[PDB]
Amino acid sequence: ASAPLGPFNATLLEQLKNDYQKGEKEVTRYIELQEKVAEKYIKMTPLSVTAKKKLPPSKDPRDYMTLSPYWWPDSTKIDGLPYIRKNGERNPEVYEYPERENANRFGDAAYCLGVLYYITGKEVYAKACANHLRTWFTDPKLGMNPNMTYAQAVPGMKKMRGSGFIDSRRFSRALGVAKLIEGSKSWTPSDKKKLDDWATAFCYWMENSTQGQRESHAANNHGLWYEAIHLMVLAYLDRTDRIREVAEQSILPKMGAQIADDGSLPQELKRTLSLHYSTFALEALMEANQITSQIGINLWSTPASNGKVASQAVDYLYPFYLNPEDWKFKQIKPFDQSRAAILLYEAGTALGNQKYVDTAKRIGLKYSTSDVETIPYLVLKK
C-alpha cells in the first residue's frame, strides 16, 4: 500500500519499508544505522518556541520570533526603534531568539522519528515523535501560536514583512510527518484533533493574513517556498482538492518568473552564494513535487502556460553540478554538492532522464551522514 500523503519521496520511503519488512540485508543494515543515529532524538528533551526570554511585540512567548539579521538599532534615535539595515553585517541580536535554531532541531527530530516509525513500525518511534509534536505545536502552554507574524521581524518598521515565512519549512515538514504516526498506539484521536485544529488555524493565517497574502503573490523564490510550505499544510489536512488548485494556479506561474530563456535564475545569480541559491530555488519545486506527484501531478514535466518547465532550469545547472569549478558567478563559499545529488535524482527520476539519475548516484551522499533529510536516499548512498 502507498505511504500516507506527506513531505518526502513516497516511492523511496515505500521501498525502504517494504524491503525492511522482508529483511533484505542492505536495507536492514542501513535502517540499523539510522536507528543508532535516532537514539539522540529519543533522548532529546522536546523543544518549545517559549524558550526565549526576549518578548515579541505581542508580549506572548508562544509567538515565534526571529530578528531579520542585517537590521540594527539606530543610535541616531533615542529608543533606536526604527532599525536600519547594514548590508553584510549580521546583528548579534539574532541570538536572543533560540527558535532560529530550535525549530530546525525540533523539525529534524520529529522527521527522523516519524520516518523510522513508518519504516520499522516500532512503537518507540511514534511515542517519541508524538512527544515532540505535542510540545512544539499543541501544548496549551508550550505550543507555538499558529502564525508567523514575527518571523524575521524588523523592530520599529512600519510596513509588515513577509519574507521570514520561509523559516516555516522545517517545522512544517514535521507537521506533515505527523501523518505517518496516525494509527500508532501513542498518537490518539485526541492528539490528532488538536493538531488538525492547529494546522487549520495556521492555514487560515497563511491564506488570509496580510503577510501570508503577500507571500502567496510573490513571483520569486520566497513565493515558491511559501507554496511548498502551503502544500505541506494542505497535505497534512488531506485537502487534495486544494493541492491540485495550488499546483495548477500558483506554483507553475511563479517558477517561470524566476527563469530565463537560457534557463538561469537571474534573481539568484546576483547573490554571493549564487549556485547554492539557484539550487535552493529549485528545491522549493522539488519539495512541492514530492507532494503533488503522490496525487498524480508531476511538476517537473508539466509545462507552464508559457511553456517553461523548471526542467529547463535544471538543464542550465547540470554542467555546473558536474563541474562546480566552471561556475562563473559569486559562490564565496564552497557549494554543497550533496543537495545537487538529491535534486538531480528527484528531477531525473520525474523526467525519466537517466543521465541526471546516473550523475546523482556518481556524486552520491555519504553513507554514514546524519542529515535526516537524506534518510530516504539509500539509493544515493551505495
Next chain:
Amino acid sequence: APLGPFNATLLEQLKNDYQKGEKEVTRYIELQEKVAEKYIKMTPLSVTAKKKLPPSKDPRDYMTLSPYWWPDSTKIDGLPYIRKNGERNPEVYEYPERENANRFGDAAYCLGVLYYITGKEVYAKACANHLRTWFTDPKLGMNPNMTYAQAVPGMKKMRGSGFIDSRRFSRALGVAKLIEGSKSWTPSDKKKLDDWATAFCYWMENSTQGQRESHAANNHGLWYEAIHLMVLAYLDRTDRIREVAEQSILPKMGAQIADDGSLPQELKRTLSLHYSTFALEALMEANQITSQIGINLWSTPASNGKVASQAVDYLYPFYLNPEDWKFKQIKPFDQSRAAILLYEAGTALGNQKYVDTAKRIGLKYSTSDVETIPYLVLKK
C-alpha cells in the same frame, strides 16, 4: 428561527404577526424600518480606520487602550505605562474601533433582524455589506483575535480583560445566520465567515489570553462564555454549547452568587447596581442561545445548589425602587436594562411578577436602541 444571539421566541412572534398583517406589529416594524434608513445609508466600518499602529504593525488587529493607563514620563520611551486610577487617558481616542465595533454591531444586528422579519432583500444586502467589510474583507476585515483589546503598552504580562469588547461584533456574527438564503449573502460569503469564526474560536479557546478568560471567576469569565456561545452557535456546534453551559457557565455563576442571592464581587464596585445587572446580562444573553437547544440557564442549578433566579430575586426590589439600593452607585441606574432582564428571566422562570414589572417599567416605544427591536411586548 435559526440559532442565534436574540430572543428567538419574540423574533418569531414578530415575524408571524407581521406576516398576518397585525396592525400593531406592521406599524412597529414600519418605525423600525424608518430607524434603519441610517444603517442602509451608512458606510461600512473597518478596524483599519485607526492611524496609530498596534505593536504588530497590522491595522487589521483590533486594538483599544486600557483607559486608566498612562505613559511614565520618568521613563525614556514612557513605555511601562502606569495606572492613574480614575483619570482616563485621552489616548483612548486614537483607537476608533472603541466606538466603531459598536456602530458596526448595531448596524448589522438591526439590518439582519429586519431582513428576518420582513424578507426585504434590501436589508440582507446592506447587512452583508457591513459583515464583509468588518469580518472577511482581505484588506479591511479584522484579524480573528483580540490580542490587543484594552492593551497596556509596555506591560510584560498579557491582559485578557479586554476580550469583553468582542460582544458587540460577536452578536453581529450571529445575525449573519439570519441573512443566509438571501440573494446578497452568497455561499462564498458564508464560507469566508465560517472560516473567520472557526479561526476566532480557535484563538478564544487556545491562546493564552483566551484560556485565562475561560477560567476567570468573575463577570469577565461569564461574558467570555456568552461570547463563546455566540461563536459556537454561529458555527452550529450544539454539542459544545451544552458542554460550555454545563462545565463552564453554571460553575462560574454558582461561584458568584451568595446565599442571599447577591453578587458580592459587584457589590464592592462604585456602580454596583449596574455591575450586578451587567453580570446577569451575560447569563441572559447566554440563555437566549442555550434555551434554543433546551437548556434553561435561569432555572438550572449549579452543583452547589445556586441558581441564577436567586440573583434576580435579590435585585428585584431594587429594580422596583432603585433609591432603596444601599451599595455604591455613583451614576443613575438605567432602569430599561432591568426591564429587559426581568422580562427575560421572568419568561424563562414563569414568574408573572417579574414579567408584569418588566412591562410596567417598560421601554420607550420610539427608542432607536437596536437591542430592543424584539421587545415590542415591553413598548406598549
